[PDB]
PDB file of N, CA and C in Angstrom:
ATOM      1  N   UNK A   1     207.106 165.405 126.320  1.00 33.22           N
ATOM      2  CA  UNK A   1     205.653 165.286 126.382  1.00 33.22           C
ATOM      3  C   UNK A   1     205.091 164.650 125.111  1.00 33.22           C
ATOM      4  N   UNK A   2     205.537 165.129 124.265  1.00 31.34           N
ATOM      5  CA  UNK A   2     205.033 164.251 122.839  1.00 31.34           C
ATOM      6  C   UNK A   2     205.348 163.030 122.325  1.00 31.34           C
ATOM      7  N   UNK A   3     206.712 162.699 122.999  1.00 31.00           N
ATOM      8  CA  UNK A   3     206.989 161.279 123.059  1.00 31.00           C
ATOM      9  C   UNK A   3     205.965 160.532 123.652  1.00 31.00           C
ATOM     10  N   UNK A   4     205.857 161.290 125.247  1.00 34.59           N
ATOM     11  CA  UNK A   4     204.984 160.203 126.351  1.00 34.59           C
ATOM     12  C   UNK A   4     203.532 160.189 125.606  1.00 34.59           C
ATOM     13  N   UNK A   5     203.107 161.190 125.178  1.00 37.81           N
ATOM     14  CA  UNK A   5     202.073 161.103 124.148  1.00 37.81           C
ATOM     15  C   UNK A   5     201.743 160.289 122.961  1.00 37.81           C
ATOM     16  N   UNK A   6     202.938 160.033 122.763  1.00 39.75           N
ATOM     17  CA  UNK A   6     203.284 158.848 121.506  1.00 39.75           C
ATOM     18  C   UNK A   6     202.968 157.373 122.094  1.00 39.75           C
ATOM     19  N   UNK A   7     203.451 157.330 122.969  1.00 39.95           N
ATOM     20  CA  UNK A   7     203.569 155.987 123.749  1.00 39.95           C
ATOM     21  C   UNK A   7     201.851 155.535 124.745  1.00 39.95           C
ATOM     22  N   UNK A   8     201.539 156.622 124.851  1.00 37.54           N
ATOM     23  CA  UNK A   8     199.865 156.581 125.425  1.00 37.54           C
ATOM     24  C   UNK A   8     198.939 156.049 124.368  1.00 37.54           C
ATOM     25  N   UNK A   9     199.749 156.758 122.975  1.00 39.12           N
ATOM     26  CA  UNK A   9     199.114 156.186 121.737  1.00 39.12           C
ATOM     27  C   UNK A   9     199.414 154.959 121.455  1.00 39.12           C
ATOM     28  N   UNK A  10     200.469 154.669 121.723  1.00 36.63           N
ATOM     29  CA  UNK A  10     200.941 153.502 121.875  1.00 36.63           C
ATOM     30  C   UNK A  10     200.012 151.943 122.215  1.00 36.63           C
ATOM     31  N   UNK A  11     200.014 152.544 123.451  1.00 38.86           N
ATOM     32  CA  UNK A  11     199.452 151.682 124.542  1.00 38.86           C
ATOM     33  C   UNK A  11     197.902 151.512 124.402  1.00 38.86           C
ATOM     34  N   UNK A  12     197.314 152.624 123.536  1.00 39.76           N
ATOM     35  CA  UNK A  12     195.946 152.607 123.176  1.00 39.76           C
ATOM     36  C   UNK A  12     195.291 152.009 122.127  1.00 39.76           C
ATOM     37  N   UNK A  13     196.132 152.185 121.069  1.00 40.94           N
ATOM     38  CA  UNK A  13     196.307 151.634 120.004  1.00 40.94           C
ATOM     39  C   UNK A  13     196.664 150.085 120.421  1.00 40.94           C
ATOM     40  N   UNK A  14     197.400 149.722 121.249  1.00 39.85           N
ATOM     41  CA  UNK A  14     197.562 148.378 121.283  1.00 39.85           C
ATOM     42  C   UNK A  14     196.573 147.221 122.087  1.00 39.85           C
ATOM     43  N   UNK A  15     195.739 148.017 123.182  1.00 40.99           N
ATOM     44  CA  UNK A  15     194.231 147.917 123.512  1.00 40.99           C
ATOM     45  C   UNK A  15     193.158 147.047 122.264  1.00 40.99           C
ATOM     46  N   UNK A  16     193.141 148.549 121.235  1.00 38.12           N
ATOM     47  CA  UNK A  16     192.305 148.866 120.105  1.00 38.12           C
ATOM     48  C   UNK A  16     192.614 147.338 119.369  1.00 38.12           C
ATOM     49  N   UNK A  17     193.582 147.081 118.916  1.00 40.11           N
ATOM     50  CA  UNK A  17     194.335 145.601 118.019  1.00 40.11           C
ATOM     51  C   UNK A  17     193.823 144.668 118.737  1.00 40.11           C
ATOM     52  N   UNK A  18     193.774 144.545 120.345  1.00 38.32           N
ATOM     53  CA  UNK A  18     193.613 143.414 120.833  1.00 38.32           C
ATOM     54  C   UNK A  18     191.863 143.627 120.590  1.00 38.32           C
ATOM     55  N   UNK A  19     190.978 144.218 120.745  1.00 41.12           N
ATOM     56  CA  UNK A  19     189.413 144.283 120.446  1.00 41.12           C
ATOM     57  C   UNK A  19     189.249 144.128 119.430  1.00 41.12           C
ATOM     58  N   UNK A  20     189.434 144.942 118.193  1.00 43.86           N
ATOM     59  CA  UNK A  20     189.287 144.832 117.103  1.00 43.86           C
ATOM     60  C   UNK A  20     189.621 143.490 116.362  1.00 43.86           C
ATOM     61  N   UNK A  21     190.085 142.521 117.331  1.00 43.02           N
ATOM     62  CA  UNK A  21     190.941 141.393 116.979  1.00 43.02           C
ATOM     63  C   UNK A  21     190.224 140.028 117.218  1.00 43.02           C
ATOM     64  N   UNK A  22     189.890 140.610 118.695  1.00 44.51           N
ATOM     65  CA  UNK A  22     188.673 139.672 119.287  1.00 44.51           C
ATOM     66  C   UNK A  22     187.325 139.407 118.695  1.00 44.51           C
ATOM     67  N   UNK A  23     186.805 140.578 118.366  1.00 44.79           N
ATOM     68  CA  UNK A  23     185.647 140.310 117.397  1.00 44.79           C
ATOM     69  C   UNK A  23     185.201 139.787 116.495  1.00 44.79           C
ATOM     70  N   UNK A  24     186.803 139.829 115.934  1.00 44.86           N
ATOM     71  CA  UNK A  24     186.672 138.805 114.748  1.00 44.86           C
ATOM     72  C   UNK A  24     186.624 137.146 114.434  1.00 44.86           C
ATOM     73  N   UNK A  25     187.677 137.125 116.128  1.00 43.57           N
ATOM     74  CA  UNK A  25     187.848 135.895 116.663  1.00 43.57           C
ATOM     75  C   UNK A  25     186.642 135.325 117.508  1.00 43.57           C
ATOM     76  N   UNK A  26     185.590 136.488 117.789  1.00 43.79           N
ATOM     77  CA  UNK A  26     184.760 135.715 118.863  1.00 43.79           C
ATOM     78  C   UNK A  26     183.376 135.672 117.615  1.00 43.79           C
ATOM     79  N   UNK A  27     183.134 136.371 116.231  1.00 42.42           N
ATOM     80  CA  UNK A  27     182.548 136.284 115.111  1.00 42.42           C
ATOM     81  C   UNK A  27     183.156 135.016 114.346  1.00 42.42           C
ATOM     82  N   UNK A  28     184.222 134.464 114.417  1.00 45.31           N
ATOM     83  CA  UNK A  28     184.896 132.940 113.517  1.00 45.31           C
ATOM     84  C   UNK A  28     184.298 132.335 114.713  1.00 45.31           C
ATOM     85  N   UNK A  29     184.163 132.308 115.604  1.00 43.10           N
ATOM     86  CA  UNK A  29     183.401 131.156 116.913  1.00 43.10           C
ATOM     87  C   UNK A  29     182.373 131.203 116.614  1.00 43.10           C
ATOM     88  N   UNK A  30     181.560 132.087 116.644  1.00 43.21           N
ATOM     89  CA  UNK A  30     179.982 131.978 116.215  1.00 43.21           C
ATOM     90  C   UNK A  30     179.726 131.434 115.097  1.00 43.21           C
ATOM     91  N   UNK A  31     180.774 131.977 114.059  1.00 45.23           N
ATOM     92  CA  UNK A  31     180.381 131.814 112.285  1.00 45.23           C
ATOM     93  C   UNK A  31     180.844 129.883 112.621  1.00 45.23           C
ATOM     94  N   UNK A  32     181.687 129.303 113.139  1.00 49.30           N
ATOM     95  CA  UNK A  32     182.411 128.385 113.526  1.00 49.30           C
ATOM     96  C   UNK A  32     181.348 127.333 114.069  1.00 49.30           C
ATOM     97  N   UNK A  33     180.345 127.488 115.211  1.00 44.77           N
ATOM     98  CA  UNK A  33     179.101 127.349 115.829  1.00 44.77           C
ATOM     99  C   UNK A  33     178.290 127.258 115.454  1.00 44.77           C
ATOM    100  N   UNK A  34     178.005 128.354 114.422  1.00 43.36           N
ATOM    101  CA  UNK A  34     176.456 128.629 113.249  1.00 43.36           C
ATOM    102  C   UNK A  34     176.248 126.778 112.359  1.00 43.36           C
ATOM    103  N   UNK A  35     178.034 126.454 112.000  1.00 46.48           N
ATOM    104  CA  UNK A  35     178.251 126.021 110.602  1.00 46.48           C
ATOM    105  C   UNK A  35     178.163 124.870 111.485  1.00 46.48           C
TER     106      UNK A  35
ATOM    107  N   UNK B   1     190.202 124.088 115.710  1.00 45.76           N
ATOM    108  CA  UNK B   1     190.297 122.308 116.480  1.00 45.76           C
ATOM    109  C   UNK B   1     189.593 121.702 117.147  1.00 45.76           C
ATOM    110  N   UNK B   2     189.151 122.728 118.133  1.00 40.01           N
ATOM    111  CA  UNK B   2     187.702 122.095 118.675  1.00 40.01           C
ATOM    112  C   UNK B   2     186.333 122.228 118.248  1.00 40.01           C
ATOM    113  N   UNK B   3     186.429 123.046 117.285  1.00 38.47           N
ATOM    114  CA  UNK B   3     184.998 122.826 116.589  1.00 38.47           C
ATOM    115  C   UNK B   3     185.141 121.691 115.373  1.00 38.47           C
ATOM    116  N   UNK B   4     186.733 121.639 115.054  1.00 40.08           N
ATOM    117  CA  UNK B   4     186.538 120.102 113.809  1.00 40.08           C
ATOM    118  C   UNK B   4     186.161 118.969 114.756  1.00 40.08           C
ATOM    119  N   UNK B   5     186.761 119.000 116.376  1.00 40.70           N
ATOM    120  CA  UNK B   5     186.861 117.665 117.059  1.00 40.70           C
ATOM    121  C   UNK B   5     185.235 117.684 117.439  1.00 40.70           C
ATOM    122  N   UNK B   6     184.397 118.687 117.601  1.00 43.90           N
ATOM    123  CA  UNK B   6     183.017 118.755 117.891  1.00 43.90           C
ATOM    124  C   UNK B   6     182.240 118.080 116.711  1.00 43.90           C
ATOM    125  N   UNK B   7     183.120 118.599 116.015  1.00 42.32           N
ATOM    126  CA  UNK B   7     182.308 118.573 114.484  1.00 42.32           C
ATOM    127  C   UNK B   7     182.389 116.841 114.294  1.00 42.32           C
ATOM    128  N   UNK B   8     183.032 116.703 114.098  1.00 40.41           N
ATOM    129  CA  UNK B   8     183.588 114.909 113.934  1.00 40.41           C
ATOM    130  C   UNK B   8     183.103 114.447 114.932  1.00 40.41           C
ATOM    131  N   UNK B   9     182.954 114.330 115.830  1.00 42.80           N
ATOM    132  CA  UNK B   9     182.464 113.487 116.873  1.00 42.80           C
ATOM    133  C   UNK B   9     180.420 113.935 116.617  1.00 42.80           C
ATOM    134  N   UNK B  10     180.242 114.862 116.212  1.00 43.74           N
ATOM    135  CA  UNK B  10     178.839 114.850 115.602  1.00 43.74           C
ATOM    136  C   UNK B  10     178.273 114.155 114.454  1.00 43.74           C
ATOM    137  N   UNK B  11     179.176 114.263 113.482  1.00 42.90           N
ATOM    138  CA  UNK B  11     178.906 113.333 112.154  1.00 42.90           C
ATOM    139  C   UNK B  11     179.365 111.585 112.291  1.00 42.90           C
ATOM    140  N   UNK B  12     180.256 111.323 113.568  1.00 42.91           N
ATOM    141  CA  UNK B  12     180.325 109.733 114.196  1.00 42.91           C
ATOM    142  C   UNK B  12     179.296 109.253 114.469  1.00 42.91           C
ATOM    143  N   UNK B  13     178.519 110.835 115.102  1.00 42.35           N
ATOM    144  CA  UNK B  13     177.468 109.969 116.032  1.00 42.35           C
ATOM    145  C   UNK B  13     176.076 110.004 115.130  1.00 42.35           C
ATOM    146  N   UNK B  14     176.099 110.947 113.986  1.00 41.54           N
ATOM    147  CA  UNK B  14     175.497 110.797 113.019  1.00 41.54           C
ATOM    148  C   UNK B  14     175.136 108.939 112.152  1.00 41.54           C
ATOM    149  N   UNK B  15     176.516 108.959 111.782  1.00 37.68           N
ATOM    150  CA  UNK B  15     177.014 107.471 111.267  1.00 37.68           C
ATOM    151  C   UNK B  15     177.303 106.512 112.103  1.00 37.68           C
ATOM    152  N   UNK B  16     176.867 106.580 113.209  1.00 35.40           N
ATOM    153  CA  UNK B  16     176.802 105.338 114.554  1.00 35.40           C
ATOM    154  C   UNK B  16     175.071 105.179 114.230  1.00 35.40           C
ATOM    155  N   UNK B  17     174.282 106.155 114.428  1.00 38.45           N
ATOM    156  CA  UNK B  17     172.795 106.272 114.516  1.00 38.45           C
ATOM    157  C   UNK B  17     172.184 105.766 113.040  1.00 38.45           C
ATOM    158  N   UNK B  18     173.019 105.765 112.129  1.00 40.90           N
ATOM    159  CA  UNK B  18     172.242 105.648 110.783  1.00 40.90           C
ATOM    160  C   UNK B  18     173.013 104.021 110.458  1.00 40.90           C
ATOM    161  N   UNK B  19     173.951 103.632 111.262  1.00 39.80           N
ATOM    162  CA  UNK B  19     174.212 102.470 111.100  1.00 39.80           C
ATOM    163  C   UNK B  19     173.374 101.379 111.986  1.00 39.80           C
ATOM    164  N   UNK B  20     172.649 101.850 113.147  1.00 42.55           N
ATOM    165  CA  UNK B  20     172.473 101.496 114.127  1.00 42.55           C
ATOM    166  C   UNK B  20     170.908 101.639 113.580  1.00 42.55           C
ATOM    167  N   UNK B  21     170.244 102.504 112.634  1.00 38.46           N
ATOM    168  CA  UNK B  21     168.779 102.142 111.682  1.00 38.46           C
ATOM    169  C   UNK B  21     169.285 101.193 110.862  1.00 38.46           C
ATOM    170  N   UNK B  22     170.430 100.997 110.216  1.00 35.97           N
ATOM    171  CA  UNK B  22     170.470 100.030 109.401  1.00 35.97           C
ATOM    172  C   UNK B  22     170.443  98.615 109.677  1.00 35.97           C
ATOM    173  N   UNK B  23     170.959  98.806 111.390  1.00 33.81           N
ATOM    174  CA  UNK B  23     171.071  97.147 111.829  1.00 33.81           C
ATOM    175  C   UNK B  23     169.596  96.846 112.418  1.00 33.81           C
ATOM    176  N   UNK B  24     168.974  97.996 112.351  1.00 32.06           N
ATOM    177  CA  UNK B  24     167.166  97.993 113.523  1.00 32.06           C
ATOM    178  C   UNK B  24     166.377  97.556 111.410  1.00 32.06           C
ATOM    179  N   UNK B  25     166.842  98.051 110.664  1.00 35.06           N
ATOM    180  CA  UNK B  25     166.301  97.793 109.374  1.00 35.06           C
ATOM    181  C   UNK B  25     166.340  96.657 108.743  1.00 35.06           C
ATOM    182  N   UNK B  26     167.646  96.058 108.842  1.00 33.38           N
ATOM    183  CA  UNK B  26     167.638  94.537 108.696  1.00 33.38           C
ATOM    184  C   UNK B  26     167.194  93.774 109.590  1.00 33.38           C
ATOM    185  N   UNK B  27     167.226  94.430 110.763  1.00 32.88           N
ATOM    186  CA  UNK B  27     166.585  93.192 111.885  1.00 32.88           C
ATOM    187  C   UNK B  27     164.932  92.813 111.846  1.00 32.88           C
ATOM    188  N   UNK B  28     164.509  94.036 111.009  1.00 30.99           N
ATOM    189  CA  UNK B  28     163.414  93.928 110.635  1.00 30.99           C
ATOM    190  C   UNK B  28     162.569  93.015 109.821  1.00 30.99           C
ATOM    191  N   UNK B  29     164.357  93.193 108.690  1.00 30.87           N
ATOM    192  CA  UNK B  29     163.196  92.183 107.715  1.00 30.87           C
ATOM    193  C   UNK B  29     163.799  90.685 107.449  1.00 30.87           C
ATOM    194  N   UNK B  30     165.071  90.360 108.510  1.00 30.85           N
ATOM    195  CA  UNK B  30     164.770  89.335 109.077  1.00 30.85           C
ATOM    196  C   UNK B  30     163.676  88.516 109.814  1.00 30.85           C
ATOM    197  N   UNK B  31     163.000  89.130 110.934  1.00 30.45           N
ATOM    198  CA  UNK B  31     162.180  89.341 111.867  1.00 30.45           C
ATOM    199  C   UNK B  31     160.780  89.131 110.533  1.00 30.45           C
ATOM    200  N   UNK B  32     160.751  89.898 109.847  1.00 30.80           N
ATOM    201  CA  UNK B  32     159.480  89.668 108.695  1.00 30.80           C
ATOM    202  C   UNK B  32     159.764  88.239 107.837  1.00 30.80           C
ATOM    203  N   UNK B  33     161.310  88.092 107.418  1.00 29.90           N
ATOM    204  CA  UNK B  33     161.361  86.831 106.792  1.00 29.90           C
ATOM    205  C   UNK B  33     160.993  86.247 107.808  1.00 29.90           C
ATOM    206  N   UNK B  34     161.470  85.773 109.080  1.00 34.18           N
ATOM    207  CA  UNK B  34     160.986  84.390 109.919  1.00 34.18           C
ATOM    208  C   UNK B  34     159.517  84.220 110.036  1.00 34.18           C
ATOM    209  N   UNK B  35     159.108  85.767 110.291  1.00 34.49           N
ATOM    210  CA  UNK B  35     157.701  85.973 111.038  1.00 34.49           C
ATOM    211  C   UNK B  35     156.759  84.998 109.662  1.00 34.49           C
ATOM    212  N   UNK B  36     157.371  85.504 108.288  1.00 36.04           N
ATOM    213  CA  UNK B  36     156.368  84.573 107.546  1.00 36.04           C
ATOM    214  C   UNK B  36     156.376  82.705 107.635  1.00 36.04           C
ATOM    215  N   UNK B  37     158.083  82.623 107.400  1.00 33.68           N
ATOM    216  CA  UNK B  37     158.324  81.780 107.959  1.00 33.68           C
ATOM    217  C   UNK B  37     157.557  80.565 109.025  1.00 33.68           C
ATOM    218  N   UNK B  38     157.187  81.476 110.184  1.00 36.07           N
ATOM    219  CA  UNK B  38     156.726  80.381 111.562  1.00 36.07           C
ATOM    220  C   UNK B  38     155.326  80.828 110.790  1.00 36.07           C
ATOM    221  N   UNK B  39     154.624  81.911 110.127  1.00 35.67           N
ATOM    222  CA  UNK B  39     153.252  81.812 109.526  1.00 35.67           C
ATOM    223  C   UNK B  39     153.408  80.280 108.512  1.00 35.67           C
ATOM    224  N   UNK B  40     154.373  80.325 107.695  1.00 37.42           N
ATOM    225  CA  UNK B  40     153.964  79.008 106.617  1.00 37.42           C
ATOM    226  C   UNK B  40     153.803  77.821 107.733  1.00 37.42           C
ATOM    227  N   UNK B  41     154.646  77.903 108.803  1.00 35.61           N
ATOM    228  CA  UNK B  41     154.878  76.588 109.326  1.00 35.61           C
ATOM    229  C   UNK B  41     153.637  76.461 110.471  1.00 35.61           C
ATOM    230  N   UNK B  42     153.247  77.907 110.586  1.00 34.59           N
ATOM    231  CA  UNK B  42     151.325  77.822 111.270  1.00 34.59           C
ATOM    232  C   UNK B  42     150.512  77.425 110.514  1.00 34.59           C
ATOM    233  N   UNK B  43     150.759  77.145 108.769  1.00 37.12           N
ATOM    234  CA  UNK B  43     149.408  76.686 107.717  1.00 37.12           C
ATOM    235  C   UNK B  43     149.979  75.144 107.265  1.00 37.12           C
ATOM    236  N   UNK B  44     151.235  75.123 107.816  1.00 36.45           N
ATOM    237  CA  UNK B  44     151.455  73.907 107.396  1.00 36.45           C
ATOM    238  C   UNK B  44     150.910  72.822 108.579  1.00 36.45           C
ATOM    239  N   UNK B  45     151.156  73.663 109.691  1.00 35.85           N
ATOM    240  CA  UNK B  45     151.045  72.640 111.007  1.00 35.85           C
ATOM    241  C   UNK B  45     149.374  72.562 111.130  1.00 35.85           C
ATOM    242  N   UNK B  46     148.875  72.970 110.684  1.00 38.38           N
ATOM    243  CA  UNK B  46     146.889  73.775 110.177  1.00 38.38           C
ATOM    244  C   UNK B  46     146.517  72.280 109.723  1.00 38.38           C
ATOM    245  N   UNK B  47     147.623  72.287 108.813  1.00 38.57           N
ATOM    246  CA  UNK B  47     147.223  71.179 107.480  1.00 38.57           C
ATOM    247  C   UNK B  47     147.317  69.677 107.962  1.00 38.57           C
ATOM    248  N   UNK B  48     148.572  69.747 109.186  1.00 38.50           N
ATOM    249  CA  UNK B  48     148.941  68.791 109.383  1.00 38.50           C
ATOM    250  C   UNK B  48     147.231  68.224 110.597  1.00 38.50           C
ATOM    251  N   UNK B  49     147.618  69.368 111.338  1.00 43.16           N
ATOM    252  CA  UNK B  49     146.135  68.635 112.683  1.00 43.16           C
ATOM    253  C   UNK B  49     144.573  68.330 111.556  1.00 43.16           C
ATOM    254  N   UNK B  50     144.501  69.248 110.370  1.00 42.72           N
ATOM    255  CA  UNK B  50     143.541  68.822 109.776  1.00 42.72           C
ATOM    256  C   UNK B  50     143.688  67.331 109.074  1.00 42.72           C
ATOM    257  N   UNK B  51     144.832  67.122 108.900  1.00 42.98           N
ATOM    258  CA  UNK B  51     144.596  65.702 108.232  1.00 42.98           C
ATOM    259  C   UNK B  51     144.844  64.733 109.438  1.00 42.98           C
ATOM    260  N   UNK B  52     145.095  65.094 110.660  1.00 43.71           N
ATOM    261  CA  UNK B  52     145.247  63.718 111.568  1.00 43.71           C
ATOM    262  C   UNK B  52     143.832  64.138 112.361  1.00 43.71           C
ATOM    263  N   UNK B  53     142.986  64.438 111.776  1.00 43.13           N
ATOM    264  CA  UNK B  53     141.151  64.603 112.349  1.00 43.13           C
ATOM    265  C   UNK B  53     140.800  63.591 111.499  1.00 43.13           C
ATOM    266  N   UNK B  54     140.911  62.502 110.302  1.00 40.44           N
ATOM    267  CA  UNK B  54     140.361  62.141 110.195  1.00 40.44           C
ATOM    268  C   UNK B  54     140.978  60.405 110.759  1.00 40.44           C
ATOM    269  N   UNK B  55     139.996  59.442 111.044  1.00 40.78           N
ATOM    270  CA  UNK B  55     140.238  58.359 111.781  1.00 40.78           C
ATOM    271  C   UNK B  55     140.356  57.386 110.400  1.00 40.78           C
ATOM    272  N   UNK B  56     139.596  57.163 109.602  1.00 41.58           N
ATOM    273  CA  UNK B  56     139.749  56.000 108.211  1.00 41.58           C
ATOM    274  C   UNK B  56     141.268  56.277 107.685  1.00 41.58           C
ATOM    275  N   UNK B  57     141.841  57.885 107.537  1.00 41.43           N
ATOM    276  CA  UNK B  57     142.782  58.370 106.564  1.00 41.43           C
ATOM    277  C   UNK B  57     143.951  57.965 107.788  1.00 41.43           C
ATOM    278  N   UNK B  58     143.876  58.397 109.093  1.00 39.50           N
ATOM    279  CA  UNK B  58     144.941  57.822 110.354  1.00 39.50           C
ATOM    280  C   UNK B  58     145.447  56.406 110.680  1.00 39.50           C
TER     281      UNK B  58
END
């Protein structure tokens, strides 16, 4: 159970990277756009 | 990449447009050199019908 728990974290956490990732990438488009 | 290729193709068309005042700017003052131009040759041609008005001097 704490493994599969590990791996939910996993999988959530790897969600989280892809958003946290995008924002920055869809903020360099704007900042990119602005300029 | 596509905002340098946006980007560049904006500052072309920048330097197409400011080349394209420069050729409307000289055409201008070509257009002003002649324009005085056919003016001298309107005071010259002035000068000319005034001196073939007279009949003793013809």
């Amino acid at each position: 159970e704490i493994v599969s728990k590990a791996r939910k974290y996993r999988q959530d956490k790897l969600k989280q990277a892809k958003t946290d990732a995008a924002k920055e990438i869809d903020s360099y488009k704007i900042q990119k756009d602005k300029e | 990449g596509n905002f340098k290729s946006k980007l560049k193709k904006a500052m072309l068309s920048q330097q197409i447009t400011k080349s394209t005042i420069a050729n409307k700017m000289r055409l201008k003052v070509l257009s002003a050199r002649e324009q005085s131009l056919d003016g001298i040759f309107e005071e010259t041609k002035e000068k000319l019908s005034g001196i073939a008005n007279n009949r003793d001097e013809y």
